[model samples]
Target: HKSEVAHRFKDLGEENFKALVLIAFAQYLQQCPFEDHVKLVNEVTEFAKTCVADESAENCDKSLHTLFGDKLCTVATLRETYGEMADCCAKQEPERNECFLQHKDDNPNLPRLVRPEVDVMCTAFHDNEETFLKKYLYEIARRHPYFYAPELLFFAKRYKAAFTECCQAADKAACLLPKLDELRDEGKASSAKQRLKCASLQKFGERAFKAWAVARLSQRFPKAEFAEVSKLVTDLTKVHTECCHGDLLECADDRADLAKYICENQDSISSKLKECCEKPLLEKSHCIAEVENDEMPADLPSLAADFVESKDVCKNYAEAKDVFLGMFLYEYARRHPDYSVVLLLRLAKTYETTLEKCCAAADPHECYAKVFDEFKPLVEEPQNLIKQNCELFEQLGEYKFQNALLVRYTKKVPQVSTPTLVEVSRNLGKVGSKCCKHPEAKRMPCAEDYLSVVLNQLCVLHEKTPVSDRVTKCCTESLVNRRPCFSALEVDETYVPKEFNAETFTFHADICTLSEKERQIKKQTALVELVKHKPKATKEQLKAVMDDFAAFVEKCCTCFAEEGKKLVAASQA
Candidate 1:
């Protein structure tokens, strides 16, 4: 029977030999003794050429062992399960090769359906790593959704080179393509997704879980400077191994689930990445500072907000104060865009020194007030005249010059009129230029001279009114006496010369015009003044006088209400 089957197989040639040999071999087996046939089938089965058409079982096993190294028996065992397709495998060479390469392990623990797809993937991977990844891996992953998880695990377990290549490709295809495209669409809006949208590394089996994480991190940050992303990747690898047993799939099922996991880890992520992302701003500050050293303020106030927010530079007073002044100047210039960049820089440099000194003062508010008072002339100078006029006027007490304008605008001499506030402004401009033009000269024109004329013109316009004489006399006396004449006049009661009427006097008419409360307050004020002059006055007398005034206020004007109570309380204290 063996001789007849061998002769038949030889006659059939290669293609038909595969199709007919199994039939002939089965008949030949039936003719033999039952136990001998069973033993023969069992003995040859381990090395059977089920997938090789032209080769003998022994030769095929040798060839498989040679091609696949230690996996020879592994491929043989897998092909044995192919059953009816055992002889038909030659026609399906690529399929048989794919199956053997993918699920050829002697002890594959994958599901029935997953093994075949895994086998096809292994074959593709075996062909060329780059080509398989670019052309075939994504298709296999999509086709075998459930198979992909275990397939990844199988590759990671058995084929490290294939697994690493797959990891790189999978990360780019599955996460990077969508992510980078999204960033291109939305720019910074998609930045949060950058580090999170990684490959499902946990699905690559426990042994190879962390391996893929390294690949993922390289792609995630994409910048060599961003060491923070690598640190987080290491942390996550350790955590997944210890906590989840490298199975991130359970922690996050879908894209959203993975995103949420990253969101929960965001604080940890941000803590690591904060300095790296902000590195650009800090470096930019330093770069600008270097190139524009003279133009930049010594205190470096321009970078104040960033410095205050930075972990690396926020602790020192010298750095912090500059940042404060820098932010103030920036915000001030932002709101007042009329100021040129140069002017802004000059002002900031000036005040930055002031801020540095004052910020360390025990009474910073008072120190700042003093500095601001000193610097106001520079800050408030008119646009065209800031450089010229500010330097000149800043030397003078601002109040001395401002008092001149204050006198004219005040209502003491009523019915003061001018063409328009425009006319008043033009007139004031003339006065300032004439007074301040030659500021460096030995004698600059005085504001007093200019304002004396201005005040006389405004007050003398209303001559019909009785207050006209008062305004003119009041101002004239001030100019002639070379003192501030707009102030209130003093009355003397040194001696009651020729005692007037006890009933009434013309002066009484003017005095009576005051309200009763006013009259009382004036009388009290007079007594207090007299006590001040009379050094011998006792405390008891002063207290008695105050008590009378308080009682008078409660009866008449209700001055004992809010302000009165505070005064009484302070006095008692």
Candidate 2:
């Protein structure tokens, strides 16, 4: 499903869409075929429910810990979101789960997001390898239960890799310290970028931000007709503007409304995307993000307004400041389809700052004379990198090279919807697979032509989005630069869905139909899901279940049971 929630995190729109899809889809594929977690969760809750119902039974916490590996921290977050000072842990057996389920606070505080200390984490890792790693898994699961658990394993895997590399280093702390720093900085940048949007909102009112957002959305929803784009932008602008209020609880309320407005009020986003609205709330965004783009409107203006590049900036600013800035943003965006809105906004802010400084001076003309020159380096540097990056991708084994491009592209635009991103990444992977096999040193043309198809897809997809002068120079000025223009020209981090569910497939008799080898793949995928789901699971236990699961699969395949199909259909549905 291509469904995606286009909510807060405006800067993340630059994130590679394909990577997000692949990562999420890959997680789903792994999670789907195995023993599903619904029953597991149900058991825990029911077990808790049962324990609570029976006053005769005591110490349900210990009992749940045996079944679910001490979800005290997990339920602790539940306490914050759903409970208050009513400490679930302190409650007796019956009261704890009851407290977890029933308690509520009219207002909840913003979560206390946590992180591991460099030395302490390393010490834990160094003390015992897999045990500590499993602890890591549990802690992440406990602390951020609201997050996608499928992704938690990814964090564990990376941490394992990091420790593997760094534990032996002379300065283990130094090496490990920076990795977390990178992650933290990425997180902070997102926070900081939102403030910039909020800054834009307060300084210029919703219209200017709305104008910026409209230009921004066009690139992502390039296929939207002029009116469809207008409607979507208005809808999007409302959520963002309302949520842009710095108040935490107030913003949360408005932020959740965007999806509600679309699903309940608008009914459908468009003909192609209408089906998504009917999906369960959890599934709706994924459904919408999956639909393919429709035809572009012929009459939609392709060029930015003339004033965007006009030289009378001082006069324009004096006449109507926000209008002129909006004009500049709208104009610049249509031209620089490759540049992220985060960068795009920053550039606009720079221009505004430069103007402010220059206009304030006693001699405005002399100071402002070289204003546009300030942006030259920012635009030019990334363009040259694009030229080399294409050459780099073209030169770099089929599988290994493809992974490079996929990883690179996926990381760049994680904000893209899963299906669209998956499709885009698949094309990129194909380009690497197909082109790398040829004697491309002499036939650079072959590689170039192959990449052009996927690059063109991105071009068509973002054809209307904003860009800087150099992006315009490279992407449009020459067919020569188009591949580079689309290549990881810049980190395109953009919109990311706040909500994610880790659940996917359910174990069913449909598995019986698969060939033994195919079943093997499904089995391993299931094993992965289990390990992530409960990192404390033993290999032997997991394998025994896999075998029993396989036994049932082949048994039904031979019989080809109708009842089996119905059950499988119901489970997946």
Candidate 3:
């Protein structure tokens, strides 16, 4: 199969090599039984390494001609060139949502020359990681659905949704494609419009869910809790909408909100969702649905809605089917009261059931499963995971998390594992005891707990006006102010200092020396650094850093100006 695929693209040069690899990867991604797919990946990876190495500064443009033959690389370049955006995202003090805003107003030319690097970056990401690529596609298409032929964007969503459902489907679940097609048929809308329409519908549904969750949680928790919980959720949804519709200003604002909320409330929400939901609600019956149809497997749609008619019938049981099937997981921490994986696994199952059972659509289950399986493992990671995959799990997870957070039902970065969270909280206690020792220990809110509080508060505000421009405006402004900015001084003092070479003579290697996991932690910590350093930086520099996280390049250079200090201190010692 690998040879056959390689031969098909033998005619295309190294540039086509990456493109062909993506198609081949997609093909393999769609076919699970093909054991030889490993061979295909190796072949593709080998060639990708070659293509990456060949794109020298001197030869890249000329090489573009040899491969594309025309002035512009296909929209494929845009797909690949997103590496810069990813790099921006990967930075210690990233602008989060504004990572890609730098190119929001770039030349909008066909086969845009400026975007090839992005395409290369996105493509490289897409090739190695189905989840990351899918997330990128969904985000880009949803944000700029018109960016690369609206039809392709529709296809991208389809690719994401179908993949999610299929991967999570048990033997009895239906296919999602046919169900989606039936919906397409039911509406007299164009395929592209249907895709956008579905996205809007989903977005609306998410908002509804958020509102519902916030109201429900508020009834149980304190008013203070509600505000803290709801705001972050609202912010996440805000960014999703901004990204989906290509609203750069909104995306930036929401991103800033996310940074601030996470920093302040990481422990609060983290504990509640990470600990509470996982142990109790996850395996518990949302409703005792009497399955008359032996045909219905454990993973089908909510049975509660079928029999129960009470006011809160759907409340307890809505998320049950996914949990029963191990498609969703709940955590146990007090402050974190949330689910881990979005019931995406469940949502996929429901979509499939609708296709095969409800809509009587043909079984596209295999197709869906092949694509969805590629993203399942990333279910428990952070929003960054969803951003990375652009595939099934991430897309659905992002949607679900956004909705939940927006409504203030859950908080923290609810993507962590429950067991891991317990350890984190325990560790936090020790650190807290050391930092600000209190003989009378008071419970500091974990991230999830804090988010939950913010969420509830925001939800109270949201209920006053579901679509209130005034509240949204105020929340947006407050959220924007709270967003963290990049700072060289902090990076230099904290992580960059630790990264310096004890042995090397020339330069200090900060984060460059940390392990990937350590690096990730250090990078996230820089957000703390930003909040600390924000008042010190010039207003212009701060604004520039807001728009471009890399604006700190100047800061890095200036910080390095007193490089001889280390040697001077050493000589004195």
Candidate 4:
């Protein structure tokens, strides 16, 4: 059944007269095979010529039924999207295209068109190129009805290549599906970046997402100079300013330039990137995405940027948290490259939950004020503890090394007892034993992962007993983020007891029975154990003890009890 569109019109108006004609044939053109586009255009051009005289399609154009496909006119959604078209059709042509180009069907139930699976798409295209591609464009346009004309052109280009590139692959779907998915997602990601900036523009503004972009760029291009940074941010800012209103061409065009610029210019990114830059525009853009965030910038800020608290946090945060927290995280990340972003992310977010609670509490001002002070030890103490522990495992060997680690963790969370702590320190020590053995530049991250796990395990132990109401709830509460909860745990006050002590040991010539490798390993472990045992020993005192012991071993396969006991006794001196 036709829309009563024909009967409803008496004068249809000259502007809308042309409007409906173009839209009518465009819909039909979308459905037909690509080879028929010229024929359809010719048919409509002749129809427009005749209909122009009468200013009507119904009376003058006999092809009206053929031109409006059932998929376009009879389907429920296609019918509704045109309701807005009809609303726009009433306006003058000057305003008509304006309404049409920018229009969206905001009806939440409106559906996206189904995408063909990669295999089916490639197969159909190879079977018959023109027919498949017309259907390709038709389906994509129908799925995303509100997308501007140029947006589809952009993907239509890639959709052709998506098959051309992957149809040759041994596993066609595996290679092709991701490319299709990438194109689909990149547009949305680009669109999301626009909202972050534009929402702020409407709602602190450039200065909002712009500042965040600067912080993020600083994290990646750590050594890049101001112009390098300013240029990149400017490209991004221009993209959002120009495109956030739905200018995909300008946005994609500018992105093309930025991706190329980031590759070609600026402080010599990499020689290997010569290969990266040579890739297809989409693939190269992804390649550059992988290459960012190498190190912290030169003038890095401390975690203080993340923790900057005031009474305004309650009012300020909920209003524009991405600006507030996004800016916070971007600042935190550039300063420390090796730390876990999840750890960093969990820190701000966990604290955000605190902010939420405090605002809802009895005395928010009081709760908010003390909130940060407790967290002061959270990152710094644990971060530094990793260095000490990472260093210990590297120097002391795993066994006795983690023995010392267990002692420290036991002290760190006193009166909390469980195998979790045992394994926590155990795996962490393994990190240094394993990961920390990497050169110092690479080692911290190795430790950071291990360190992250062990701290998480501590919270599981905290899940049980008198680990204090404070630490217990922290573990019981934040599941993925138990580490930071424990990181900031308020320490139990230190009071010295009547007694504390160390273990006894011996170094004898009988140890020489093993191979030289075993002998050397034995010596290092013995030295570290002595180092752990005499925790209060002076550097020179330990040095002298090790010196005398080494001398005694070389000459003293002949390693004597008098010299050993004397050296041990005097080493304690």
Best by TM-score: 4
- What would the TM-scores of all predictions be? 0.15, 0.34, 0.20, 0.37
Listed per model in order, the count of residue pairs whose N, CA or C atoms clash below 3 Å is 3, 34, 91, 2
Q: Runs in model 2 with CA error above 4 Å?
A: 1-143, 146-215, 222-256, 263-272, 287-327, 334-336, 353-377, 397-573
Q: Tell me model 2's lDDT, rounded to 2 decimals.
A: 0.47
Question: Which candidate number has the best lDDT?
Answer: 4
Looking at model 1, which ten-residue stretch has the lowest summed lDDT?
288-297
Per-residue lDDT tens digits for candidate 1, residues 1-573, read: 223223323443342333222222222122222333234333333333342343443345343213222232233432454443334344343344444333222223333322234445556566775444332222322222222132222222233343444435634245433442333223222211221122223333432333333333322322322244445445556554432222222322332233334345544332334333333221221221112111111232333344333433223446555435434443444333343333344455566676566556575545544443544655444343434544544564333233223222322332223222123333444566554554432112144334444544444344433333444566444222322354342322232222222122111233345776465434433333333233243456555645755464545443334454454334332
User: Where does the lowest 10-residue lDDT sum fall in candidate 4?
Assistant: 1-10
Q: Candidate 1 vs candidate 4: which has greater lDDT?
A: 4
Tell me the TM-score of model 3.
Answer: 0.20
lDDT of each: 0.36, 0.47, 0.33, 0.54
lDDT, candidate 2, 1-573, per-residue tens: 111122211212222222222222222122121123223333344444444455344444343222222333343333443345235556665555444334322123335546667677778777876456654544333332222332344455566777778767888787876676655443333334444455456656776666667556554455444455556667677656654532222333444455565555442333455566665443444344335443334454533233334446667787877666655665555455455453456566677887777766676666766656777766655445444544666575433344344434444454433334444654565554544444423134344444544555554445566433334445453332355455535543342323322343355555666665465445444333333334333446544554555555556653435443443343221
**How does model 1 fare in lDDT?**
0.36
RMSD of each: 37.6, 23.3, 26.8, 19.2
Ranking by TM-score: 4, 2, 3, 1
Tens digits of per-residue lDDT, candidate 4, 441-555, equal: 4454455544444554455456544544555666554333555566665434452221223333566677667776466455655544453343444556655766677787766
Candidate 1, residue 409: the lDDT equals 32
Look at candidate 2 and tell me the lDDT of residue 256: 43
